[PDB]
Every structure is written in structure tokens, then in C-alpha cells.
Amino acid sequence: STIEEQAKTFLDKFNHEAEDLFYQSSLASWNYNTNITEENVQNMNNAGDKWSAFLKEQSTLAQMYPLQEIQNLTVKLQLQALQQNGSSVLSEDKSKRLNTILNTMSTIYSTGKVCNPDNPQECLLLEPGLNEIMANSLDYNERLWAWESWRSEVGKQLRPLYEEYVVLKNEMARANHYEDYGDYWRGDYEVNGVDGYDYSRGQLIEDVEHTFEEIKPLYEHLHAYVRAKLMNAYPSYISPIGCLPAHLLGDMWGRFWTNLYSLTVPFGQKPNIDVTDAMVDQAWDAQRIFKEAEKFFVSVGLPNMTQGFWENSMLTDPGNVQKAVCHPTAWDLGKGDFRILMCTKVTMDDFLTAHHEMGHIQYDMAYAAQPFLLRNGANEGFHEAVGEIMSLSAATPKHLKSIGLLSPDFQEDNETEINFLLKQALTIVGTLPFTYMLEKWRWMVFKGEIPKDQWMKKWWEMKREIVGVVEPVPHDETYCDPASLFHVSNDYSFIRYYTRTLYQFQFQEALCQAAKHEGPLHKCDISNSTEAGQKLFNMLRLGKSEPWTLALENVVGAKNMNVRPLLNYFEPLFTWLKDQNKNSFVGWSTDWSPYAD
Amino acid sequence: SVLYNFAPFFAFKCYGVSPTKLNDLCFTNVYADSFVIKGNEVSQIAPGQTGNIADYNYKLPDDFTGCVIAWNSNKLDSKHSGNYDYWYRLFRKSKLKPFERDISTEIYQAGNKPCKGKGPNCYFPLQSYGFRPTYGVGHQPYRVVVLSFELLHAPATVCGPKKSTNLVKNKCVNFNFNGLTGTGVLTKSNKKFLPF
Incomplete structure (x- = not known):
């Protein structure tokens, strides 16, 4: 009556005849990436495909063991996967149409060239030229011509193309028991049956909205700064109380x-x-x-x-x-x-x-x-x-000092700390507000909270709102402003970047105490400790055997993300960050539109 | 002695017998087994230690046994497409009494199924180690020689090399010519000890 054991074997083979297939499929890839030729491409076309073979079939011979009887979670997990037919289950003729879509858009974005707005000659290609044009000058115009050079353009090409995938992608999901692709996408964390360490597939959503509505205070003052320091290098333009328009911001889309x-x-x-x-x-x-x-x-x-x-x-x-x-x-x-x-x-x-x-x-x-x-x-x-x-910890005024590299002659002061932060806080706190939206929108659009004939509205709505940006120019319902960047057009969940920004500070402040800190935490440096050393391995070891929930507890000390620790790293700054504003304004006047003007 | 004529023999654990005196004393007779295996398993092969190698492929007992010798053989044994020649038995039926042996391919089964098994698996015990040259030093091929001595009723014949001292002649000297002992001056002679 072994319902299991009659499977603890099925794994015992897989575990051996896979590694060998996987070795000779990752090898292929090095050889190419290292040496770029043609036969090499092909040489990987085979084993870079073969692996597939193994996979599909094993899934077939994996549901043959109704998970229900498995109780050793170790095996309830090694199995959890394999079975997952995911796609393939989807209609055939339809699975085709999907396979198609991806390509089209996933391709469009690639070569997408922008000819001059004043000549069919300056057809800048993104990689070099479109980009520079954005993270380069300051003059207006070309910044708009570029925020114009893509949205109502290289994305319109796929505007309805995005409206396409949203159809089948949600179909597949349904089948695999997942209201929306987002419910599929919101799963890497779903931890089921572990007593106390349990976690849902929606709990996440709320923990986000919590952690985020705690950050606003910081971010709020940062759009407060720039908003004015972007009224100096700029003439009558940025209304002193509205939203920093696109183009004139940072990169292209502006993550x-x-x-x-x-x-x-x-x-x-x-x-x-x-x-x-x-x-x-x-x-x-x-x-x-x-x-x-x-x-x-x-x-x-x-x-x-x-x-x-x-x-x-x-x-x-x-x-x-x-x-x-x-x-x-x-x-x-x-x-x-x-x-x-x-x-x-x-x-x-x-x-x-x-x-x-x-x-x-x-x-x-x-x-x-x-x-x-x-x-x-x-x-x-x-x-x-x-x-x-x-x-x-590598680039610490200490490490580089104590490492016979950085002139120990370090005349360290306040206006450098106060300064190393606006750097590490323009790319780890100005990215947060944006990582939300995108996810929200789709997490919704998918679920179907917006009808295509409105999709556009929300974007801009939740752009003056959560973030603080207004559309340089008014935009038409047939523009995929959201879908106009790698991830959006290459099916990639984008919340691994909001949960990596909040687990890094929960790891710093924890493997810091262990090595005896006591001052500005940005000053931490675990180098040469050994207590923290073990702290990590006792988690780096469990690979994916145990739930993430408890993996934290081993380290950190709880089991749910925390925005507190992060709001301590720049705590120094949040002082000079209120004394520098002093009498200037804070908060955005949603109405003011540099185009609706 | 020419046992040190091997490389830094990755092992030589002499469980059971004093590693030293190896050549100092003799036992009835000694067998020397041998096989190729990955280096992440060169420990299973040891008194008591468990696992797959000791379970369906070669289980020692606990008795001294004598010793063990291991050396990495990649250099010549490994290949570049997969030395898919050395094999192992992922699953037999139970286990083996110290020093047993089973080679019957016997496609594994059991399960009272149309193909008695573990869910359309009907696995086959023999799998191919398949070494390659770029692997770790834990998946690279090591060679082993298990030394099994023994002291039955009759003598330690095999026994070992003993040294001399050169002859002296004309001086009290104690002795051990062949196996006869005594103390005396070993002068020349004049006898004709018949050829035997």
C-alpha cells in the first residue's frame, strides 16, 4: 500500500538522468557566450533543446502519483514542480497564436529605431543614442521628442499586441487553477501547510500596500527636493507644486x-x-x-x-x-x-x-x-x-581604507555622508514608487479591474498619484505607455525588485549587530567577523527545501518583510532632507499639467 | 613497501590492523578488491558507513579488513563526451552481507503492477557514472583497492620481506641463518653439504 515510496523512486532516477542532461546544456551555453560562432549556436540548439525532451515526458510520468498521498514535504515539493503542466494544457491552435504574439512584440522593442523628428536620418537605435538622448542633455524638446519617440510609436506597434497576450495568458491560467496570470505570477511565495510559517497567495498584496504606505514620508520629501532643484536648471516649466513631467526626469521610461x-x-x-x-x-x-x-x-x-x-x-x-x-x-x-x-x-x-x-x-x-x-x-x-x-560592505570608506587601496588619508566629513546617500537613495528609493504601479496595473488589468477602453487612463491616473509624474503631452487610449520596456514586452514578473530592496536592509541590520556595530549603519562592514558568517550559511544551506517564511527567522528574526530597517539606512539623510526643504512646498498638485496648460 | 609507490593515495585508512607493522607481521592470506567510483562516495566504503555504494554495490563488514587505498584517476579515466562505461546499481531488493556480490542485470520491478513497479517506472538498477574532465573534485573518478587480510588455521605463508646484515666470519656474532638460531664464530668450511 505504498502510495509514496512508489515514487520516492521516481525521483531517485530523475535526480541522476537530469543533472547529466543539464550539464551538457549549460556547457553548450558557456561555449557560445564565451566563443561567439555559428556551429556553437547549433551545438547548443540540440542539448539546449534535448533538456526540454526529458522535462515534458517526466511531467507526464509525475501526475501518475496523485500528490494527495505524499506527506514528506521534501517530496511533496520536488513533485510540486515537475507535475505543473502550466502551458501545453492550453489549446493547441491557440497555444500557437500565443507562441506567435511574444515574438512580434518581444522583437519590436529590439531593433525599434527612432528617425529624427526633423529628418529621416537621425534614426537613433535605443541601445546607443535613444538612451543617451535621455540620460545626457538637459534642453527640453529632444526629451519630449524622445518621450514621444516610443510611446505613441514603438509601443503602438504592439498596443493591441499587448491587448492580445492578456487574452490567452489568462486562459491558460484559469485551467491551471489561477484566477489571473497575476495569481499565477503571485505564487513563488505561496507557502502551504507548515504551521505558523504558512503564507497565502494574496496576503502578499496587503503586506505590500502596508510597507509602501510607510515609505511615502521619505519619497515624498525627495520629489520635494528635486522638484525645486529642477526649477533652477530649468526655466518657466516645472510648476513648483505639480508633478515632475517624464522626458525631463532621468532615464527613458525613468525606472x-x-x-x-x-x-x-x-x-x-x-x-x-x-x-x-x-x-x-x-x-x-x-x-x-x-x-x-x-x-x-x-x-x-x-x-x-x-x-x-x-x-x-x-x-x-x-x-x-x-x-x-x-x-x-x-x-x-x-x-x-x-x-x-x-x-x-x-x-x-x-x-x-x-x-x-x-x-x-x-x-x-x-x-x-x-x-x-x-x-x-x-x-x-x-x-x-x-x-x-x-x-x-565592499565600498565602505573603511573597507577600501583598511584594504591597502583607499588613501587611509580619508578626511571624512558630514557633506559626503549626506552626499553618498542622495546617490544610494535615487536608485533604491526612487525606483520603489515605480516598481509598485506597473505591478498593480497588470496585477489588475489581468484580474480585469480595467477595460482596455480605459487601461490608458489608469496609467496616467496612477502616475500623478502613487509616483508624481504627469504625461508631458496628453496620450491616446491606443498607446501602450505601460507596455514599452523590456520586462513589459518580455513577460517578466517585476516584484522581485520591491522585495529585494526590502530584504537587503533586513539582512544588513542583523548580520550587522552580530559583528558589533554601533554607529551610522551605512557605516557597517562585516568584513573579518565570523558570527555573522555563520548567520548566513544557516540559510544559504536550506536552498529551497524549507519555506521562505522561516528561512528569514533563521536570520533576520521574524518572517514578514519590514520597511522599518530600510528607513534606517538613510535615517541620517531624513534630517538634512527636512532642513533643506524648510519653507519650500511638499506634496504634488495633481491638477497642474504642463500640457493641460 | 612499493605501496608508497602510489601518489598521495587520497586515502589509506587501516581500520582493523595497525597501519604500521604492515610488513612487520604476516597473516594466512590477503585479497585485494578494486573498482572505479566518484569521489563523493569514497567514504561510504568504510566499516559501518552507509549509503548506496554500501547497500547494493559493495558492503564491507566491520572486521579490521586491513586497509583501503584511493587515488583520483580522472587524468586517464575521464573523457570529454562522458566516460559512460563505469556503472552502479541504484536499487537492488534489500542489501548485501559483508562482501557479497550481485551482477544480474535483472531489470528492477516489484509493485504487483502490469509491470510491478513504482508508477510506470519499471526502473533498471544499472546506471552509468559518466565522468567528464571539467567536473568538480567530488564528481571526478577515484580508484579504490580494498585490502582484505586473514589468518586461517595453516600459516601466514604470503608473509613479508625480511632484511639481512651481511656475513661477518671470525668474530662472536649471534645469528638467524634461515630460521636456526645460536651464538658462535662463523668461520669458512670444508664440507660438501650434498646439493639439498
């Missing part, structure tokens, strides 16, 4: 606000410390950047980097005409095979990258002792977070 440290600089008479120079002075070579990282980790007592790393990792540009893809990215072809592929260019914007892409490999080396179908991260954003905390 981050980083491209601005100039216009707003607390005391533009400070040093902005940069160890670049000194690197070029000690003659620091590439194989140094990595040996440094390795240490930081071994200092706090964590495994050294293996010998297959220092002997198989493309740690520089693509050799000769060896056309290579230059994207920093640590791999894990399995079987102890760990590798990194970054074209480290000597500087301090790559020395942090290392500490960021070695943490990926240091997590990937703890979960290495778990069933293949349970080697990942408790939830979506525990993977970045656990390797950004490193690019935080």
Missing part, C-alpha cells in the same frame, strides 16, 4: 533616477571618493579584483573559490576577435562546475561587481548539497539581495 547626482548634489564642493586612480597606481591587475573578493568571503569564514573557477572562468575581454558577450554573470553548469564571465575593466565600478557576483557563487555552493529540483532560492529575490549586501 531609476540615478542619472541626476549632478543637478542635485548636497554640497557639490565635496570629494566624491573614487579609488579608480589608486587602482591604476599600485598597478592593480584583473586577477586582483577577484582575489580580493574571494578574501572578503573567506575572512568571514566561508568556502574558498574552487580550482575549477581560477582555471575555467573568462575573467577578461573576449581574447582576440573572439567576439564575446560582455555581461557579468556567474554560472553553475552543475557537478561542482562553477564559473564567472565578466570582462573586469580595472576600476571601482567593477571591484564592487566582483563582490556582487561572487555571492551568487557562494550561495550556489551551499545549496549544492540538495536535490536538483530544490537548488535555487527560497523566493524570487533572495538571490540578488544575498549578493548586493556584499557590494554594500
Whole structure:
């Protein structure tokens, strides 16, 4: 009467005849990315496909074991997946139409060129030119011509195309028991049956709206600053009490606000410390950047980097005409095979990258002792977070100091702290307000809270509202303003970025106390501790075996995200951030429209 | 002695017998088994230790046994497409009495199903280790030689090499020519000890 055991075997095979298929499918990919040819492309077309084979069939022979009887969660989980037919279940002729859609849009966005608004010659392509045009000058016009150069254009191409996928995508879902694609998308966290550690698939929504309605106070004062420091470099334009229009903001769509440290600089008479120079002075070579990282980790007592790393990792540009893809990215072809592929260019914007892409490999080396179908991260954003905390302690006026790199001659003051923050708080607090909306909208649109013939309205509505931006020009219902950026047109859930920004500060303030902090927390530096060292491994080890809910408790100390810790990192700033406003205004006058004027 | 004529033999745990005196004493006779295995399993092979290697593929007892010797063999054993030659038995039926052996392919079954099994699985015990050269040092191929000595009723014949000292002649010297003992001056001679 073994309903299980008659399956604890089904896994025992999978676990062996997969790894081998997966090794020879991730290998293929290195070889290409490393060496860019043609046969290589094909050489991966096979095994980069084969893997698929294995998969589908095993799913077939996975529902053959009604999960109901399984009780060892370990196996209730390794199975939870496999079964998941997800797509395929969807209609055939229809599954076709879907397969199609994606392509169209997912392609459009790619080559999308913008010819001059005053000549069929300046047809800037996004990658280089469209972008610059945005994060470059200051003059008006071209900023609008560009905010115009895409929305009612490179997205209209797909305006109804977005209206397309929303149809089938929701169909598939229904079947797989998921009101809306968003209910499918809102699942990586759904933890079922664990007593106390339980978590729903909707609870999330509320915890978000909570945590967010706590941030407003900060963010509010930041659009308060710029709003005026964007009334200096600008003439009669930004109404002093309304919304910072698009174009004149930062990037293109404007996820981050980083491209601005100039216009707003607390005391533009400070040093902005940069160890670049000194690197070029000690003659620091590439194989140094990595040996440094390795240490930081071994200092706090964590495994050294293996010998297959220092002997198989493309740690520089693509050799000769060896056309290579230059994207920093640590791999894990399995079987102890760990590798990194970054074209480290000597500087301090790559020395942090290392500490960021070695943490990926240091997590990937703890979960290495778990069933293949349970080697990942408790939830979506525990993977970045656990390797950004490193690019935080790395660039500490101390570390770089104590590391025989940064002139210990550090004349450290207040107008530098007050200043290193507007930087780390224009790209980690100005991105938050935007990560919400997008998600909300679709999480709704999907659920069907908006009818296409209105979709547009909401965007702009929830753009002067939650964020604080007005449409430079009025926009038409047939423009997919929302759907006009990689993620939107490449089906990618985008809340792994609001839950990674709030788990990083819950990890800093926790593995900080452990190493005896006591001052501005931005000043933390776990380097050389060992108490925090163990703190992490006791979570990096459980891979995906246990619920994320409890994974936190091991570390942090609770089991639900918290906006408190983050609101402490910049706590310093939130002082000079109210004394700098003093008598200026705060809050947006939703009405004022630079176009409705 | 020429046992040290191996590399840093990744192991040599002499459970049971004093590792030393290895050549100092003798036992009835000694067998030497051998096989190829990944390095993430070179410990299962040890008195008491459990797992797959010791479960359907080679279970020692607890008796001294003698020792064990392990060396990485990737260099020559591994390949670049998958040395899919060495095999193992993922599942038998129960286990093996210390030093048993089973080679019957016997496609695994059991389950009283049309194909007695664990859900259309009807798995087959033999799987292929399939090594490659880029793997970790835990999935790379190690070689093992299990040393099984024993002291039955008859002697330790096999026994081992003993050293000399060179002859002296014309000086009290104690002795052990062959196995006869005594103390005396070993001068020349004049006898004709017949050829035997």
C-alpha cells in the first residue's frame, strides 16, 4: 500500500538522468557566450533543446502519483514542480497564436529605431543614442521628442499586441487553477501547510500596500527636493507644486533616477571618493579584483573559490576577435562546475561587481548539497539581495581604507555622508514608487479591474498619484505607455525588485549587530567577523527545501518583510532632507499639467 | 613497501590492523578488491558507513579488513563526451552481507503492477557514472583497492620481506641463518653439504 515510496523512486532516477542532461546544456551555453560562432549556436540548439525532451515526458510520468498521498514535504515539493503542466494544457491552435504574439512584440522593442523628428536620418537605435538622448542633455524638446519617440510609436506597434497576450495568458491560467496570470505570477511565495510559517497567495498584496504606505514620508520629501532643484536648471516649466513631467526626469521610461547626482548634489564642493586612480597606481591587475573578493568571503569564514573557477572562468575581454558577450554573470553548469564571465575593466565600478557576483557563487555552493529540483532560492529575490549586501560592505570608506587601496588619508566629513546617500537613495528609493504601479496595473488589468477602453487612463491616473509624474503631452487610449520596456514586452514578473530592496536592509541590520556595530549603519562592514558568517550559511544551506517564511527567522528574526530597517539606512539623510526643504512646498498638485496648460 | 609507490593515495585508512607493522607481521592470506567510483562516495566504503555504494554495490563488514587505498584517476579515466562505461546499481531488493556480490542485470520491478513497479517506472538498477574532465573534485573518478587480510588455521605463508646484515666470519656474532638460531664464530668450511 505504498502510495509514496512508489515514487520516492521516481525521483531517485530523475535526480541522476537530469543533472547529466543539464550539464551538457549549460556547457553548450558557456561555449557560445564565451566563443561567439555559428556551429556553437547549433551545438547548443540540440542539448539546449534535448533538456526540454526529458522535462515534458517526466511531467507526464509525475501526475501518475496523485500528490494527495505524499506527506514528506521534501517530496511533496520536488513533485510540486515537475507535475505543473502550466502551458501545453492550453489549446493547441491557440497555444500557437500565443507562441506567435511574444515574438512580434518581444522583437519590436529590439531593433525599434527612432528617425529624427526633423529628418529621416537621425534614426537613433535605443541601445546607443535613444538612451543617451535621455540620460545626457538637459534642453527640453529632444526629451519630449524622445518621450514621444516610443510611446505613441514603438509601443503602438504592439498596443493591441499587448491587448492580445492578456487574452490567452489568462486562459491558460484559469485551467491551471489561477484566477489571473497575476495569481499565477503571485505564487513563488505561496507557502502551504507548515504551521505558523504558512503564507497565502494574496496576503502578499496587503503586506505590500502596508510597507509602501510607510515609505511615502521619505519619497515624498525627495520629489520635494528635486522638484525645486529642477526649477533652477530649468526655466518657466516645472510648476513648483505639480508633478515632475517624464522626458525631463532621468532615464527613458525613468525606472531609476540615478542619472541626476549632478543637478542635485548636497554640497557639490565635496570629494566624491573614487579609488579608480589608486587602482591604476599600485598597478592593480584583473586577477586582483577577484582575489580580493574571494578574501572578503573567506575572512568571514566561508568556502574558498574552487580550482575549477581560477582555471575555467573568462575573467577578461573576449581574447582576440573572439567576439564575446560582455555581461557579468556567474554560472553553475552543475557537478561542482562553477564559473564567472565578466570582462573586469580595472576600476571601482567593477571591484564592487566582483563582490556582487561572487555571492551568487557562494550561495550556489551551499545549496549544492540538495536535490536538483530544490537548488535555487527560497523566493524570487533572495538571490540578488544575498549578493548586493556584499557590494554594500565592499565600498565602505573603511573597507577600501583598511584594504591597502583607499588613501587611509580619508578626511571624512558630514557633506559626503549626506552626499553618498542622495546617490544610494535615487536608485533604491526612487525606483520603489515605480516598481509598485506597473505591478498593480497588470496585477489588475489581468484580474480585469480595467477595460482596455480605459487601461490608458489608469496609467496616467496612477502616475500623478502613487509616483508624481504627469504625461508631458496628453496620450491616446491606443498607446501602450505601460507596455514599452523590456520586462513589459518580455513577460517578466517585476516584484522581485520591491522585495529585494526590502530584504537587503533586513539582512544588513542583523548580520550587522552580530559583528558589533554601533554607529551610522551605512557605516557597517562585516568584513573579518565570523558570527555573522555563520548567520548566513544557516540559510544559504536550506536552498529551497524549507519555506521562505522561516528561512528569514533563521536570520533576520521574524518572517514578514519590514520597511522599518530600510528607513534606517538613510535615517541620517531624513534630517538634512527636512532642513533643506524648510519653507519650500511638499506634496504634488495633481491638477497642474504642463500640457493641460 | 612499493605501496608508497602510489601518489598521495587520497586515502589509506587501516581500520582493523595497525597501519604500521604492515610488513612487520604476516597473516594466512590477503585479497585485494578494486573498482572505479566518484569521489563523493569514497567514504561510504568504510566499516559501518552507509549509503548506496554500501547497500547494493559493495558492503564491507566491520572486521579490521586491513586497509583501503584511493587515488583520483580522472587524468586517464575521464573523457570529454562522458566516460559512460563505469556503472552502479541504484536499487537492488534489500542489501548485501559483508562482501557479497550481485551482477544480474535483472531489470528492477516489484509493485504487483502490469509491470510491478513504482508508477510506470519499471526502473533498471544499472546506471552509468559518466565522468567528464571539467567536473568538480567530488564528481571526478577515484580508484579504490580494498585490502582484505586473514589468518586461517595453516600459516601466514604470503608473509613479508625480511632484511639481512651481511656475513661477518671470525668474530662472536649471534645469528638467524634461515630460521636456526645460536651464538658462535662463523668461520669458512670444508664440507660438501650434498646439493639439498
